[PDB]
Amino acid sequence: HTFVVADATKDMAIMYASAGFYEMTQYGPEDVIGKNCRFLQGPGTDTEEVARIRRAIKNGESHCGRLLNYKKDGTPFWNLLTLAPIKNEQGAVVKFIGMNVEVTQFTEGELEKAMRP
Amino acid sequence: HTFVVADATKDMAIMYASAGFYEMTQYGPEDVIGKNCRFLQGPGTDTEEVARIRRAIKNGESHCGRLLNYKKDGTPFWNLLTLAPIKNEQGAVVKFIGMNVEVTQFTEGELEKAMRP
Ligand SMILES: Cc1cc2nc3c(=O)[nH]c(=O)nc-3n(C[C@H](O)[C@H](O)[C@H](O)COP(=O)(O)O)c2cc1C
Numbered sequence: 087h088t089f090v091v092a093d094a095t096k097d098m099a100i101m102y103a104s105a106g107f108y109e110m111t112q113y114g115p116e117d118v119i120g121k122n123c124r125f126l127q128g129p130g131t132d133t134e135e136v137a138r139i140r141r142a143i144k145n146g147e148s149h150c151g152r153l154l155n156y157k158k159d160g161t162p163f164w165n166l167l168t169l170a171p172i173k174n175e176q177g178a179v180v181k182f183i184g185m186n187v188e189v190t191q192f193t194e195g196e197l198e199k200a201m202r203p
Numbered sequence: 204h205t206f207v208v209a210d211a212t213k214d215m216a217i218m219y220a221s222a223g224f225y226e227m228t229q230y231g232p233e234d235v236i237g238k239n240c241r242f243l244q245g246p247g248t249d250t251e252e253v254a255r256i257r258r259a260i261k262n263g264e265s266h267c268g269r270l271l272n273y274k275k276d277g278t279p280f281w282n283l284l285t286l287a288p289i290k291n292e293q294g295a296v297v298k299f300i301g302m303n304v305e306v307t308q309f310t311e312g313e314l315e316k317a318m319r320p
Pocket residue numbers: 090091092098122123124125126127136137139140143153154155165167169182183184185186
């Protein structure tokens with residue numbers, strides 16, 4: 087579990103983050119709770135992927151996209167961000183969940199372990 | 204594990220698929236091994252997301268995107284497809300892995316179970 091929960095009734099502020107998120111990004115709760123996760127973005131982050139994200143959230147749609155993000159120490163990393171709306175019984179969006187995967191090289195070795203009969 | 208492995212030295216033909224893939228899509232190995240996974244696409248599949256996928260594969264890049272796909276019975280489903288290149292020691296791309304997530308509604312209930320201290 088690397089994920090965060092954002093509150094649609096407080097302008098998509100992060101209301102919760104998993105332990106994995108703090109460890110992946112190196113930021114602590116003081117930098118995250120109550121904030122918008124756009125703070126991870128930085129030089130080179132793709133403007134059009136960011137716009138796709140924004141639209142998906144506005145439309146209440148699930149989404150995924152690779153985005154460049156930055157750790158607290160300024161290390162760039164690729165983040166496969168998937169997003170899903172959480173609705174109430176009225177069918178209104180009250181939260182979003184986001185799941186963050188830090189891309190690493192997938193090796194022939196790891197594939198063998200994945201495929202091994 | 205829902206994933207498939209494609210062989211870059213046989214034009215991205217699927218060389219392996221996990222049990223989860225057969226069950227998610229309802230297709231059997233006879234419809235999958237040796238094929239290109241584009242066969243899951245259909246009416247309404249987003250042309251530009253498909254083009255993003257194509258470019259990522261050509262550039263040897265990791266990627267994610269939501270795509271409409273179809274099960275064997277013709278049921279449409281949203282597929283959060285993530286892709287990652289597998290390189291040899293020369294640094295050349297010899298395979299791709301693809302991981303397929305079938306989007307379902309995420310409920311306030313599921314979130315409570317995810318967040319529950
Ligand atoms: C639940 C959730 C998680 C998010 N996680 C990230 C993330 O890890 N990295 C990131 O760059 N953007 C993330 N975002 C996206 C930003 O919060 C923001 O929605 C995006 O940059 C587009 O809006 P903007 O154009 O106002 O910045 C997340 C959004 C949501 C709703």
